[PDB]
Amino acid sequence: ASVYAWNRKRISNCVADYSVLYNSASFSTFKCYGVSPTKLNDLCFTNVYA
Amino acid sequence: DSFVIRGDEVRQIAPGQTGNIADYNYKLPDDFTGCVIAWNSNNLDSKVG
């Protein structure tokens, strides 16, 4: 997407690992707010959105 | 203590950090006292091939 017209993916009714994500050398940035990435794998969410 | 790591992984050398170096190679105590010092050594540690 162009940033003036960004795109949302809803994530729901599913399971994931986040540690495979934040250890990936592909990510030129991986900041977090209200949660620590180290803690993500212990959680569950009503939904997640990207 | 001394070792070589790649320039990205230098960010893992702190108390409270995670990632393969901090996880499985060299864990600082999360209440460490002292100094962490680093420099690029591409001109000394890299080899042809």
Swiss-Prot record, chain A:
Substitution effect: T29A: In strain: Omicron/BA.2, Omicron/BA.2.12.1, Omicron/BA.4, Omicron/BA.5, Omicron/BQ.1.1, Omicron/XBB.1.5, Omicron/EG.5.1
Domain of life: Viruses
Effect seen on changing L21I: In strain: Omicron/XBB.1.5, Omicron/EG.5.1
Self-association and partners: Binds to host ACE2. RBD also interacts with the N-linked glycan on 'Asn-90' of ACE2. Cleavage of S generates a polybasic C-terminal sequence on S1 that binds to host Neuropilin-1 (NRP1) and Neuropilin-2 (NRP2) receptors. Interacts with host integrin alpha-5/beta-1 (ITGA5:ITGB1) and with ACE2 in complex with integrin alpha-5/beta-1 (ITGA5:ITGB1). May interact via cytoplasmic c-terminus with M protein. May interact (via N-terminus) with host bilirubin and biliverdin, thereby preventing antibody binding to the SARS-CoV-2 spike NTD via an allosteric mechanism.
Protein's job: Attaches the virion to the cell membrane by interacting with host receptor, initiating the infection. The major receptor is host ACE2. When S2/S2' has been cleaved, binding to the receptor triggers direct fusion at the cell membrane. When S2/S2' has not been cleaved, binding to the receptor results in internalization of the virus by endocytosis using host TFRC and GRM2 and leading to fusion of the virion membrane with the host endosomal membrane. Alternatively, may use NRP1/NRP2 and integrin as entry receptors.
Protein name (record): Spike protein S1
Species annotation: Severe acute respiratory syndrome coronavirus 2
Part of the whole protein covered: 348 to 397 of 1273
